[PDB]
Amino acid sequence: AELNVEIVAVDRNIWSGTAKFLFTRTTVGEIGILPRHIPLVAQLVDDAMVRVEREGEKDLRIAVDGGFLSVTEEGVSILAESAEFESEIDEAAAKQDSESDDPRIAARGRARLRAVGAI
Amino acid sequence: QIEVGEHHTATWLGMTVNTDTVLSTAIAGLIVIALAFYLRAKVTSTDVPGGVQLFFEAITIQMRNQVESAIGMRIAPFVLPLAVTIFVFILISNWLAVLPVQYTELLKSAAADINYVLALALFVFVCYHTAGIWRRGGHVTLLAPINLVEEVAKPISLSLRLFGNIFAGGILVALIALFPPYIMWAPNAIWKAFDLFVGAIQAFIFALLTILYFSQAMEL
Amino acid sequence: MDPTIAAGALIGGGLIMAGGAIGAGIGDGVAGNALISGVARQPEAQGRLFTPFFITVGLVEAAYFINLAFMALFVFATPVK
Amino acid sequence: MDPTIAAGALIGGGLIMAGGAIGAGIGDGVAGNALISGVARQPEAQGRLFTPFFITVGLVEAAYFINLAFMALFVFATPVK
Amino acid sequence: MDPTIAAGALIGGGLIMAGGAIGAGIGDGVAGNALISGVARQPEAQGRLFTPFFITVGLVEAAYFINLAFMALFVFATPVK
Amino acid sequence: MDPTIAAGALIGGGLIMAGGAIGAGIGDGVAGNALISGVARQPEAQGRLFTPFFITVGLVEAAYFINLAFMALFVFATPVK
Amino acid sequence: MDPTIAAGALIGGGLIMAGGAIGAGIGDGVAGNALISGVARQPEAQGRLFTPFFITVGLVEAAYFINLAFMALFVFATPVK
Amino acid sequence: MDPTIAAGALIGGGLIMAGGAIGAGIGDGVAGNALISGVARQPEAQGRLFTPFFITVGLVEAAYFINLAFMALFVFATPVK
Amino acid sequence: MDPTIAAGALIGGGLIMAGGAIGAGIGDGVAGNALISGVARQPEAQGRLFTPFFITVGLVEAAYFINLAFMALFVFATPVK
Amino acid sequence: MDPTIAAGALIGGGLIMAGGAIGAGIGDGVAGNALISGVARQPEAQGRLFTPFFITVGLVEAAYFINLAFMALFVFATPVK
Amino acid sequence: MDPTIAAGALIGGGLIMAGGAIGAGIGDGVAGNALISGVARQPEAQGRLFTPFFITVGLVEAAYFINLAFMALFVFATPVK
Amino acid sequence: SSNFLIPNGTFFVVLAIFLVVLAVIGTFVVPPILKVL
Amino acid sequence: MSTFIGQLFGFAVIVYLVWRFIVPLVGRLMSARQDTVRQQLADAAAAADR
């Protein structure tokens, strides 16, 4: 089976498709959604990452900022201020961003790192 | 109809020795040295690795990540070999008991003897103790005497946890003996499979608790 | 007499095994509860959760088998005859 | 006498089985609680949760059946006659 | 004597049944707790939750009835007369 | 003697009833806990939750009353006189 | 003798009351836990939660008082004199 | 003899008080757990939560003191002399 | 005889203290669990949570010390000599 | 006789220590569960949570060591010789 | 006689070890439950969570091994011969 | 009879067997494998 | 010999167990883990290639 996934940014639809499994990290702890699942509302951690897993492709890793997450009978919906796919990230820019003193951009950089497979 | 703690015995320098209890121990030791030299004969760096090599590397980096998150690896790398030693040497030492002997059966466990387990546990003790004082030279004041129990606990715990664990099978395989032969094979198989499992898990536990006791001996 | 000691040893061994069984059974139950919940909350976490789980079990069953050993010492090599 | 030892063996075996029953019953209960909760959490996760669940049970019932064995050793092949 | 063995058998059977009752009662309770909670979360999950629930019960009551059997073996076909 | 058997039967019946009481009491408690929690979440779920709840109780009290029966068999129609 | 039976009856009644007390006490505790939690979530749910709560208690205390009755039957109208 | 009955009464009273203590202690504990949790959620709910809490305690301690009474009846006005 | 009564008193007092210890220990544990959880949620709730907590303890330890008193009455001023 | 009293004292002390061990073990377990959970949700909260935790333990182990003391009074300075 | 004291010592040691086993087993279980849950969502926490966890275990197993010591004192260096 | 949970000289024996075996893969396995890693 | 014929009547079912289920599984897995390092050394060859 498969579950419908939709990631919407504040001013754009980041992604929309179907998936086999969906891993992310709520403020309360990491979590993995599967095609059927309890209705749920949660808030992703500040430097969260979203790994979508699809049947015939390679898994799609996304960095998310200020995200919220909700699972319903129709599928998963992730609400983000901003999102950045894995094949769009400068790991060195994200690295120097990670060592900032500003918590917000530090979390942005940590998420961009998590997406690229570092940290 | 059966009585536990019976193995042949003798003496060597006034100390009493088990005439049993040492043959299967040496079988385990020579097996580990064997597969180790077999590794060395079929080791590689840029090939496809042999089954022995993949087995041992899985074990090795498992223990390695355990150590490194428990302690800074550089701080005490010497525990990594000591860990692997403990694992395989105990693993086989229980799995050696899989083979069927009884007519009285003396190919069975080395851990069914209190002294073998006592030696392993108290060696682990001397090592992490000297490591603790090598590093440094309770959480509440009046809680302190409990702490005294704590480190007298660990070698005891490590010792009897293993003995009783294998001794269990060391008894059960005997009991089931007097169960009728035309039926005994099925519970025999069931218990033997579960004993394989428990031996594996128990070697795992002894190794992991070894590492963690090293750690809490060596942190700061 | 002698049989009185034998009976005392049998009852004592029984108590030791009963305590061991209660402890091990409930301890493994309460540990597996967390294991299943973790695997239900995150599946790819299974291979991870098998490290703390079996640590816990290694402790729990330990107390069990120690008792088992002493039960033998009570029943077969009774200390006082 | 001899019957005194027999009675001690019967009481000891009883205690061993009682401890086993308490341990196994509550352990399987506390494990199945997590199993059912996971199933409700994710229906498909069932085929996945049957791996840790039965591991837990394999431990719990283990302590039970070990006791069972020793109970036999207490009642039938009583160590001291 | 002989009655001493009979009394030992009665007490042992009593202990076995008491352990069985505690184990089964609390195990079924702790399993039904999860069942009811799941059915309170998702009503149409009921037909699903009856698979893990009855699995758990199948284990719990198992330990019970095994004890029951052995209790009979203690009381009626007492091993040592 | 004969009174020794009678006393053994009384103690055994006592143990059986005690185990039954512990099992039933705690099992019904742990089931009613889930029932009340469900009714605190969704009031109009009450008429629904009475199906799994009473199923659970039907199991729990079962183990109780079975013991009760056997207690009678221990006390009134004592197997060995 | 006769006093031996009397003592057996006293011990059996004691066991029955002890089991009853453990069962009732913990069962009412685990039920009131859910009651208080529900009333802490929704105050105006109190008048509602008193329906399932007292149902649960009606079961729990039941097992208690049944035991109480039988305890009397053990102590006053002892079955075998 | 007579002292045998006296000893049986003392042991029975002991068992009754032990069961009472376990039941009351754990029941009050499991009730106060919910009370404290409710007061940690909503401070001004305290004056409210004291209604269900003390109801629960009124039940729990009840089973205790009943046992206490019967313990006296076992120890002082022993039914059979 | 007289020593038989003395031994019965010692065993009864032992049972009373054991029940008291189990009850008090677990009750205080289950209460402190809620206390710590509340203080982990809201630090400045500590000074508040010490009101319900110590109420609960005041109940739990009560059942303990009552038993303690009666244990003395069993051991020193034994009712029947 | 005198040895009968000695045996009663040994059994009573055993019961007292067993109750103490159960109470302390489970109480510290249920308290450390909350401690670890608080540290898991909030690690920095550790230095804070060590205040309520050790309070709880101070209560739990208290009941233990009190029993320990009385066990000595049962075993060494037996009240009735 | 002397064997009566020996039997009392064996039964007392048995009780002490049984209490120890129940306490340690369930305490380690309830602690490992929290450990696994913390590692479930926060696998990284495992390294940190190993500080409070082993503290808890250090307490729990403490009560166990203390009992173990005293059990030896009951069995080998029996206080009263 | 045999209070078989009191130690025996056999202890020292396997300590030897353990010691050398440790020393064995102190050279023969894991320094090679850690370098292979 | 009864006890030996019985214990290895059990041994037969044990290694029938292992040859039907487990070592095929670890064959799958160790084949995969050999394939991975094989592919990565092939990738190193392709990298020096490039």
Coordinates of C-alpha atoms in Angstrom, one line a residue, chain B:
Chain B
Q1 CA 18.2 -39.8 39.5
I2 CA 20.7 -37.1 38.7
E3 CA 22.9 -34.8 40.8
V4 CA 24.5 -31.5 39.7
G5 CA 28.1 -30.4 40.1
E6 CA 29.8 -33.7 39.2
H7 CA 32.9 -33.7 37.1
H8 CA 36.1 -35.8 37.4
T9 CA 38.9 -34.3 39.3
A10 CA 42.6 -34.6 40.2
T11 CA 45.5 -32.4 41.5
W12 CA 48.5 -30.7 39.8
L13 CA 50.6 -28.8 42.4
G14 CA 48.6 -29.4 45.5
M15 CA 45.7 -27.4 44.1
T16 CA 42.7 -29.5 43.1
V17 CA 41.9 -29.6 39.4
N18 CA 38.9 -30.8 37.4
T19 CA 39.8 -33.7 35.2
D20 CA 36.6 -32.7 33.3
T21 CA 35.7 -29.0 32.8
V22 CA 39.0 -28.3 31.0
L23 CA 38.6 -30.4 27.8
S24 CA 35.7 -28.4 26.4
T25 CA 37.3 -25.2 27.6
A26 CA 40.4 -26.1 25.6
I27 CA 38.2 -27.1 22.7
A28 CA 36.7 -23.6 22.7
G29 CA 40.1 -21.9 23.0
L30 CA 41.6 -23.9 20.2
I31 CA 38.5 -23.3 18.1
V32 CA 38.8 -19.5 18.5
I33 CA 42.5 -19.6 17.7
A34 CA 41.6 -21.8 14.8
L35 CA 39.0 -19.5 13.1
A36 CA 41.3 -16.6 13.9
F37 CA 44.2 -18.1 12.0
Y38 CA 41.7 -19.1 9.3
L39 CA 40.8 -15.4 9.1
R40 CA 44.5 -14.5 8.8
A41 CA 44.9 -17.1 6.0
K42 CA 41.9 -15.7 4.1
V43 CA 41.9 -12.1 5.2
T44 CA 41.6 -9.2 2.7
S45 CA 41.5 -5.5 2.2
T46 CA 40.4 -5.0 -1.4
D47 CA 38.5 -8.2 -2.2
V48 CA 35.3 -9.8 -1.4
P49 CA 35.7 -10.9 2.3
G50 CA 35.3 -14.4 3.4
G51 CA 32.5 -15.6 5.7
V52 CA 34.9 -15.7 8.6
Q53 CA 36.0 -12.1 7.9
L54 CA 32.5 -10.7 7.6
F55 CA 31.4 -12.5 10.8
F56 CA 34.3 -11.1 12.7
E57 CA 34.0 -7.6 11.3
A58 CA 30.3 -7.4 12.2
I59 CA 31.2 -8.4 15.8
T60 CA 34.2 -6.0 15.8
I61 CA 32.5 -2.8 14.8
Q62 CA 29.4 -3.6 16.8
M63 CA 31.7 -3.7 19.9
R64 CA 33.5 -0.7 18.5
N65 CA 30.6 1.6 18.3
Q66 CA 29.4 0.4 21.7
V67 CA 32.7 1.3 23.2
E68 CA 33.1 4.6 21.5
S69 CA 29.7 5.9 22.6
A70 CA 30.3 4.5 26.1
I71 CA 33.8 6.1 26.3
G72 CA 36.1 8.1 24.0
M73 CA 37.6 5.2 22.1
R74 CA 41.1 6.8 22.1
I75 CA 40.8 6.9 25.9
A76 CA 40.7 3.1 26.2
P77 CA 41.0 1.2 22.9
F78 CA 42.3 -1.9 24.8
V79 CA 38.7 -2.7 25.8
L80 CA 37.7 -3.4 22.2
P81 CA 39.8 -6.6 21.9
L82 CA 38.9 -7.6 25.4
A83 CA 35.2 -7.2 24.4
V84 CA 35.4 -9.3 21.3
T85 CA 37.4 -12.0 23.2
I86 CA 34.7 -12.2 25.7
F87 CA 31.9 -12.4 23.1
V88 CA 33.2 -15.2 20.8
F89 CA 34.9 -17.1 23.6
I90 CA 31.7 -17.3 25.5
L91 CA 29.5 -17.6 22.4
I92 CA 31.2 -20.9 21.4
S93 CA 31.5 -21.9 25.0
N94 CA 27.8 -22.2 25.1
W95 CA 27.2 -23.3 21.6
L96 CA 29.7 -26.1 22.2
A97 CA 27.0 -27.5 24.5
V98 CA 24.8 -28.1 21.4
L99 CA 26.6 -31.3 20.6
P100 CA 25.0 -34.5 22.0
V101 CA 27.1 -36.6 24.4
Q102 CA 25.2 -38.2 27.2
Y103 CA 25.3 -41.9 28.1
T104 CA 27.2 -38.7 32.1
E105 CA 28.3 -36.2 29.4
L106 CA 31.4 -34.1 29.6
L107 CA 31.5 -32.2 26.3
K108 CA 29.0 -29.8 27.9
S109 CA 29.4 -26.3 29.1
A110 CA 32.5 -24.6 30.6
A111 CA 30.1 -22.1 32.2
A112 CA 28.4 -24.9 34.1
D113 CA 31.5 -24.7 36.4
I114 CA 31.6 -21.9 39.0
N115 CA 35.3 -21.5 38.6
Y116 CA 35.4 -20.7 34.9
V117 CA 32.7 -18.0 35.3
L118 CA 34.4 -16.8 38.4
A119 CA 37.7 -16.4 36.6
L120 CA 36.2 -14.5 33.6
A121 CA 34.2 -12.1 35.9
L122 CA 37.0 -11.4 38.3
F123 CA 39.4 -10.8 35.5
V124 CA 37.1 -8.2 34.0
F125 CA 37.0 -6.8 37.5
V126 CA 40.8 -6.5 38.0
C127 CA 41.0 -4.9 34.5
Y128 CA 38.3 -2.2 34.9
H129 CA 39.4 -1.6 38.5
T130 CA 43.0 -0.9 37.5
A131 CA 41.7 1.1 34.6
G132 CA 39.6 3.3 36.9
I133 CA 42.7 4.0 39.1
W134 CA 44.7 4.4 35.9
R135 CA 42.4 7.2 34.8
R136 CA 41.7 9.0 38.1
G137 CA 44.6 8.1 40.3
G138 CA 28.0 8.1 45.4
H139 CA 25.6 10.8 44.1
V140 CA 24.5 11.5 47.7
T141 CA 26.5 11.3 50.9
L142 CA 24.5 8.9 53.1
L143 CA 23.8 6.7 50.0
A144 CA 27.5 5.9 50.1
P145 CA 27.5 2.4 51.8
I146 CA 25.1 1.2 49.1
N147 CA 27.9 2.1 46.6
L148 CA 30.1 -0.4 48.4
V149 CA 27.5 -3.0 47.6
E150 CA 27.4 -1.7 44.0
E151 CA 31.0 -2.8 43.0
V152 CA 31.0 -5.9 45.0
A153 CA 27.7 -6.6 43.2
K154 CA 29.0 -6.4 39.6
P155 CA 31.6 -9.2 39.7
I156 CA 29.1 -11.4 41.6
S157 CA 26.3 -10.4 39.2
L158 CA 28.5 -11.0 36.1
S159 CA 29.6 -14.3 37.6
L160 CA 26.4 -16.0 38.7
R161 CA 24.3 -14.5 35.9
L162 CA 26.3 -16.5 33.4
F163 CA 26.7 -19.7 35.4
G164 CA 23.1 -20.0 36.3
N165 CA 22.2 -19.1 32.8
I166 CA 24.0 -22.0 31.2
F167 CA 23.8 -24.3 34.2
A168 CA 20.0 -24.2 33.5
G169 CA 20.5 -26.0 30.2
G170 CA 23.2 -28.0 32.0
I171 CA 20.4 -29.4 34.1
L172 CA 17.6 -29.5 31.7
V173 CA 19.2 -31.6 29.0
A174 CA 19.7 -34.2 31.8
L175 CA 16.1 -34.1 33.1
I176 CA 14.6 -34.6 29.7
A177 CA 16.8 -37.7 29.5
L178 CA 14.3 -39.7 31.5
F179 CA 11.4 -38.5 29.5
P180 CA 10.4 -41.4 27.2
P181 CA 12.8 -41.7 24.2
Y182 CA 10.0 -42.0 21.6
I183 CA 8.8 -38.6 22.7
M184 CA 11.8 -36.9 24.3
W185 CA 13.3 -35.7 20.9
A186 CA 10.7 -32.9 20.4
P187 CA 11.2 -31.1 23.8
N188 CA 14.9 -31.9 23.4
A189 CA 15.0 -30.0 20.1
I190 CA 12.9 -27.1 21.5
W191 CA 15.1 -26.6 24.5
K192 CA 18.3 -27.0 22.4
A193 CA 17.2 -24.2 20.0
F194 CA 16.3 -21.9 22.9
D195 CA 19.6 -22.7 24.5
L196 CA 21.4 -21.7 21.3
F197 CA 19.5 -18.4 21.5
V198 CA 20.2 -17.8 25.2
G199 CA 23.9 -18.6 24.8
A200 CA 24.2 -16.0 22.1
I201 CA 22.2 -13.4 24.0
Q202 CA 24.2 -14.1 27.2
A203 CA 27.5 -13.7 25.5
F204 CA 26.1 -10.4 24.2
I205 CA 25.1 -9.3 27.7
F206 CA 28.4 -10.2 29.3
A207 CA 30.3 -8.3 26.7
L208 CA 28.1 -5.2 26.9
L209 CA 28.0 -5.1 30.7
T210 CA 31.8 -5.5 30.5
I211 CA 32.1 -2.4 28.3
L212 CA 29.7 -0.3 30.4
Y213 CA 31.5 -1.2 33.7
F214 CA 34.7 -0.2 32.1
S215 CA 33.1 3.1 31.2
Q216 CA 31.6 3.9 34.6
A217 CA 35.0 3.0 36.0
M218 CA 36.8 5.3 33.6
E219 CA 34.6 8.4 33.1
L220 CA 36.6 11.4 34.4

